[PDB]
Design an enzyme around this catalytic site. Structure first.
Site, PDB file in Angstrom:
ATOM      1  N   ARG B  11       0.826  -1.220   0.000  1.00 54.27           N
ATOM      2  CA  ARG B  11       0.000   0.000   0.000  1.00 54.27           C
ATOM      3  C   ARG B  11       0.858   1.267   0.000  1.00 54.27           C
ATOM      4  O   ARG B  11       0.638   2.164  -0.807  1.00 54.27           O
ATOM      5  CB  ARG B  11      -0.956   0.023   1.200  1.00 54.27           C
ATOM      6  CG  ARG B  11      -2.174  -0.880   1.063  1.00 54.27           C
ATOM      7  CD  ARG B  11      -3.478  -0.108   0.911  1.00 54.27           C
ATOM      8  NE  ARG B  11      -3.476   0.784  -0.245  1.00 54.27           N
ATOM      9  CZ  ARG B  11      -4.459   1.627  -0.558  1.00 54.27           C
ATOM     10  NH1 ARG B  11      -5.565   1.706   0.177  1.00 54.27           N
ATOM     11  NH2 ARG B  11      -4.339   2.395  -1.625  1.00 54.27           N
ATOM     12  N   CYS B 142       2.193   6.269  10.784  1.00 56.06           N
ATOM     13  CA  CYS B 142       1.187   7.143  10.155  1.00 56.06           C
ATOM     14  C   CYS B 142       0.492   8.060  11.165  1.00 56.06           C
ATOM     15  O   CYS B 142       0.267   9.236  10.868  1.00 56.06           O
ATOM     16  CB  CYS B 142       0.156   6.336   9.338  1.00 56.06           C
ATOM     17  SG  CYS B 142      -1.119   5.443  10.269  1.00 56.06           S
ATOM     18  N   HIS B 169     -10.254   5.869  13.924  1.00 64.45           N
ATOM     19  CA  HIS B 169      -9.408   5.425  12.827  1.00 64.45           C
ATOM     20  C   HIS B 169     -10.185   4.583  11.818  1.00 64.45           C
ATOM     21  O   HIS B 169     -11.117   3.860  12.174  1.00 64.45           O
ATOM     22  CB  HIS B 169      -8.254   4.601  13.403  1.00 64.45           C
ATOM     23  CG  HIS B 169      -7.035   4.578  12.541  1.00 64.45           C
ATOM     24  ND1 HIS B 169      -6.866   3.680  11.510  1.00 64.45           N
ATOM     25  CD2 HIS B 169      -5.922   5.347  12.557  1.00 64.45           C
ATOM     26  CE1 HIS B 169      -5.699   3.897  10.927  1.00 64.45           C
ATOM     27  NE2 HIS B 169      -5.106   4.905  11.543  1.00 64.45           N
ATOM     28  N   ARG B 189      -9.458  -7.504  17.226  1.00 68.82           N
ATOM     29  CA  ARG B 189      -9.088  -7.569  15.799  1.00 68.82           C
ATOM     30  C   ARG B 189      -9.578  -8.860  15.103  1.00 68.82           C
ATOM     31  O   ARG B 189      -9.603  -8.945  13.880  1.00 68.82           O
ATOM     32  CB  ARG B 189      -7.584  -7.333  15.620  1.00 68.82           C
ATOM     33  CG  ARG B 189      -7.217  -5.879  15.906  1.00 68.82           C
ATOM     34  CD  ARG B 189      -5.758  -5.574  15.627  1.00 68.82           C
ATOM     35  NE  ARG B 189      -4.883  -6.132  16.652  1.00 68.82           N
ATOM     36  CZ  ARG B 189      -3.576  -6.355  16.510  1.00 68.82           C
ATOM     37  NH1 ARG B 189      -2.938  -6.065  15.371  1.00 68.82           N
ATOM     38  NH2 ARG B 189      -2.892  -6.886  17.525  1.00 68.82           N
TER      39      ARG B 189
END
Lengths: 294, 324, 334, 320
Positions: B11, B142, B169, B189
């Site tokens: 990415r 990030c 997020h 997750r």
């Protein structure tokens, strides 16, 4: 019991009342009973209706319920005032300040206040709060637009596609907490972040306390304050797990933080709630208790 | 002209390449990734969140033909084997999971898309620390690129005692598409990332010290992963040394604004920051200064595109580091 | 009462357990899975699409305590070493993925083991493929391992059978508007199996994808072998799917005839409805397939006709419900 | 050609945006009843179609755009709008209220209507002077160049259409009473597969008379905010292969009808200029006995594909 306004809160209040003994429920709403019967039967977020519905009114699981369509005479949103209620208004949150007979009109509060109140109350009793800022990560709601278009209330953020964005929004819940817990009047402010889930929300509160505390002290205090309204869990759950619940607020011990820098401390406490059914359950709990008094 | 090599065409690598197309004295002359070129070319062209590629991409023997320009794409396992200098490459973007094995006959410098003895740099925040001597440097995480300019602005103007950070997020590739067993054992997750609000821990608020030493130990935070595929917003609640107003805070952020740190007073949403070039975008409409008794809490909010904001920053560092 | 064993407590194994709770004459008395019980219990309890578990679940040494009743949870890598009969297990749901052939599935059949096995994977050639209330008649009982078929062939089969029996099918093309699935990437990245479409963000895209369920309908309904083919558009809902079948029939028909035929063919597995429902309404349903009369079309232009016919299904719980039905029935024959 | 836009919703705004990137087409007046602060915000910022390519500031009257002043009025009835004051020759009627001749006649020179009067789909039947014309529906602009290609090469007998469609403003964000009594559009549009009827298939006769009465269809509305695909299962006169139809469509490709063999998805077609993009990878030609069913599939962005076609029609129509 008589429901004026058969929107999302109305239909769920009804559903909730079917599984409560001494209440039962007449309805009033301007839309087609065919439309309303279909929406009562079938629900995206809250699943199919527990029973039967067939369309004078409609009959549910046998019992007839008369559904009228009167323009002028409470969950419509049009008549949100003291004078505007046919036969200072007391803001009540069950198992928090329902201990405050008589009355013309009472308010069951906002869906977010019912999440915040028990947690904020627990902090004031045990530790004493000086101040705090609230953030609610909130499901999207009917007042948001499905796609970018002119909002009726002139709000440039609620104008945006609600299920394709993170959308900041103002909430009075935190500031209007004084009306349920006067001890906290003027101590709490906050905002919201509306996100792409159709229902289910969490409220985060960062606050400064009177005496120093540990993470375990905070969690224990909340477990001790737990009841029918204020849940407690240490399971690492997510928003889909709190959809349809009966707790008005569900504290999550896993997200708690107590940051100590120098001697000074910042305390973070986090509580889940289904803005739909958590509120509606606390609404019915109050609705039942209030009919009991006169 | 700064010739660039990308190791790892995931990415970040693909978005770095995309970004570099619209930056003047920077050009990618060598890509190295182990996956099928046909898969890579298709993902370079087509991009869910960041749109179609601004151009044309065809696979060939040896490499890609991008806008006519041939770019070699190799598939070397060990970084030692890559002959970067053959394609004029003076700097490498390391974006997989490593690393001076790039430095040989090979490149001269390298940037890691991570954080280790290596300098961590957030551009227009602490890129002054680069004297030019360095062999490996890191651009940071990030969320670090988002928080840092905002945090720094508070510490320069008012001084920070402490603060707690919450990031709402976008969901990420480390989350399951549907309820299933998570490899690591994480029970959150494990759940459907595009169908839940999922609480998560982040160490970006802690490791801010590596970029802004003054704030080391002072900042902590967490995240709420939500159902958008990209785009994020970081809220910082903090205690300051001086008393402030909301206007003073906003005016300070405006005065600290650059290419990396944007300033706005428009009531925007997350899709409005998708694909932006700012590392962080301060939103003055979400500012709060709560004063109860004499004491103050200051809430301060900044948007970022966890993909492209980072990548834009990453490329700025990449070009500047190479030009010392 | 049919005592059942589950080998492989994944998505399907957990849903089969959930489903079994609200069915009588079927009970789970042994589970076997190699993952941490804490992880398993948690995922049994909490479920994004199918909701919170109906009851309580606590982890314990030896197994789980589900709403009082203790259920044994072993972690045997080899099926030969699972003493199923010790917990009076009669039939085994084989949902692991690693024993998807006959001989492999037959490792559950020994003296102190099970008597029969049902695999979630395809029944290949020497393993019969059963869709309940469609072709479960083919089980004589002497069988050792059977397959409960794919999720889509459980939806397509009753609707395609009803057309064949009543009107006769020449040919047809199927389109399934399907929930996104585990094999799709959550964000844009390289797919392991090379697929450039499953490479894309599954919950942010309409994604075309092939499906052999239309082509492999012959294994269930040999009449239709070679007549049907189809494809899928995967879309952003976590579960719930809808299947459309455009077909040419042998007889000429009206819209009211076909809807009546489906109502007459209706049963426990094949639901009928005329309410204008959406995908969230069919989440958690016990019907393998739910026919929707409101979407039915019969386009007559010239003498020639095209018949479009549509049915809902929950690719998670509809499949599971058909799986539990075939699992129950197959135990009662020997 | 100076253009006026009545109704500044999704189509109206995107048309404005599109017209910025078109040589000799200029918007010099907009008319919408909602607040210019609201409208200017929604032009600047667009969830699915990205930030505006330029600056927009609300000013006295209307709003400035890249320095230049564009008037923004708020007149209910299409009369009263003094379009000629700002020099506009043609009007894009995009409200949805004035969805007919007579109502669309706000002449007091040309009008293009956004509802289904002569119905045009550019590069298909723009060869067919006039005052009020229709640019057709969004779905019709996808289907038409695809169906036309099958009629011209192979001849169509019969066909059934299914469009997998992005959710739209006429669906509810959460479950609630729909104004038009639709029990499905009542439901949470972004959390459901929502079946829904469309007349684009039936009204294709208006664009391609040859196919009148021959095509029917429906739609499955799915959770993506924009971007759609149309599937057509159909019986043809001649016998065909998969390769023959794919080569037909490629030969019929132009500015309006795209051709691709890449295995794309719906986000890849967001903001495209093609009115329809044929996808060869989804083509089927099932042969059972001698009889054949042919499946043809085409992508379109219900927002920008439709709009791009709308702006082609509009430009051309002013120049006749």
């Amino acid at each position: 019991v008589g429901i004026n306004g058969f929107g999302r809160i109305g239909r769920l209040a009804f559903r909730r009342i079917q599984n409560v003994e001494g209440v039962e429920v007449r309805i009033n709403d301007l839309t087609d009973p065919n439309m309303l019967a279909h929406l009562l039967k079938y629900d995206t977020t809250q699943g199919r209706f527990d029973g039967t519905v067939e369309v004078g009114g409609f009959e549910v699981n046998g019992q007839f319920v008369k559904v009228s369509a009167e323009r002028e005479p409470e969950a419509t949103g049009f008549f949100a005032s003291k004078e505007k209620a046919e036969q200072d208004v007391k803001t009540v949150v069950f198992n928090t300040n329902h201990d405050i007979g008589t009355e013309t009109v009472i308010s069951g509060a906002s869906c977010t206040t019912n999440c915040l109140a028990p947690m904020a109350k627990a902090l004031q009793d045990n530790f004493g709060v000086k101040q705090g800022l609230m953030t609610t990560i909130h499901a999207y709601t009917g007042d948001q637009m499905i796609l970018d278009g002119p909002h009726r209330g002139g709000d440039l953020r609620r104008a945006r596609a609600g299920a394709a964005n993170i959308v900041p929004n103002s909430t009075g819940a935190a500031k209007a907490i004084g009306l349920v817990i006067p001890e906290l009047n003027g101590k709490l402010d906050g905002a919201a972040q509306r996100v792409p889930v159709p229902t289910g929300s969490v409220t985060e509160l960062v606050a400064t306390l009177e005496k120093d505390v540990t993470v375990e002290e905070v969690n224990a205090a909340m477990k001790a304050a737990a009841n029918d309204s204020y849940g407690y869990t240490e399971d690492p759950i997510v928003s889909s797990d709190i959809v349809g619940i009966s707790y008005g607020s569900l504290f999550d011990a896993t997200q708690t933080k107590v940051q100590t820098v120098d001697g000074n401390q910042l305390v973070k406490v986090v509580s889940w709630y289904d803005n739909e059914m958590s509120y509606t359950s606390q609404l019915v709990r109050t609705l039942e208790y209030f009919a009991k008094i006169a």
